[PDB]
Chain A
Amino acid sequence: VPIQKVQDDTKTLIKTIVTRINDISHTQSVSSKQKVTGLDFIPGLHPILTLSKMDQTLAVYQQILTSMPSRNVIQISNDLENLRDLLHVLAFSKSCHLPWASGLETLDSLGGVLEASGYSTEVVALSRLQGSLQDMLWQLDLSPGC
C-alpha cells in the first residue's frame, strides 16, 4: 500500500465532497460558519485537530445524510464512509489503531427536525460538512496525529 497515493486520494475525496456541495446551488448561498440553533448536534466548524475527531465527525454526518431522501445526499454519505476508511488506512500506516466510529447515539432527536424542517437540516448539514472538510484538507499536510 503506497502511503503517498493514499494521502493524495484522501485529499481528493475531501475536495470531492466539497465540490459536490458546491454544485448544490441552495447550499452555496448559506453561510458555512453561521450557527443555527437546534442543529448543534451536526459537527460544524469547531476545531477538528485529530484523526479520531475527523472519524467521529464523518460518522455523524453519514448518519444524518443517510436519513434524508435525496439522490445527491446518499452518495455524499457514501463518500463520507470512504473518507473514514481512508483515514483508517492512514492511521494504520502511522501505526495507529482507530476504533470504528459509531454515529451519534442521540438520533432520537433528529427525527423531529427532519419532520418539521427538512430544508434547514439539509442546508445546514451540507454547508457545515463543506466547512469541516475544508479545515480537514488544510490540516492533512500539517502531519495529523491520532
Chain B
Amino acid sequence: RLDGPGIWSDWSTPRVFTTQDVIYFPPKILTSVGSNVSFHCIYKKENKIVPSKEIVWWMNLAEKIPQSQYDVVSDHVSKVTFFNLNETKPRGKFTY
C-alpha cells in the first residue's frame, strides 16, 4: 500500500526470460500507406556486440537494402529509414 504503514506482499512467482541473439526494435510495426517507419537492430556474434559498420539489412531474404538508407545512430546499433511506404504485397498466407 502506497499510503501508510502497509505490509509488503509476498513475491510474485519468478519469471525467467532468456533472450535470443539479434535484437529488433521494434519487433513489429503496424502502419498505413504513405507513412514513414524505421527499424533499429543489434547483432550479437559469439558473445560480442559487433560494430554498426558491419551490419547489413535485407528484406524477405530476397535482396539487400540500398546503403543510402542506412544511418549509424550509435557504435553498437544500426538503423534503416523507409520513406513513402507502399502497400505490402502478400506472399501466400503472409500479409507483411
Contact = CB atoms under 8 A, between A and B. Distances in A.
B91 A116 contact: no
Contacts of B60: 26, 29
A29 B94 contact: no
Interface residues of A, number: 10
A30 interface: yes
B92 A26 contact: yes
Contacts of B32: none
Interface of B is mostly: loop
B28 to A, nearest CB: 13
A8 B84 CA distance: 52
A123 interface: yes
B20 A29 contact: no
A3 B42 CA distance: 56
A89 B75 CA distance: 60
Contacts of A29: 60-63
A29 B62 CA distance: 5
Contact of A123 (B20, B61, B63): B61
Interface in B1-35: 20
A25 B61 contact: no
B23 to A, nearest CB: 14
A68 to B, nearest CB: 11
Contacts of B20: 116
A111 to B, nearest CB: 14
Interface in A104-146: 116, 119-120, 123
B91 A25 contact: yes
Nearest first, the 5 A-B pairs at minimum CB distance are A29-B62, A26-B91, A30-B61, A25-B91, A123-B61
Interface of A: 24-26, 29-30, 70, 116, 119-120, 123
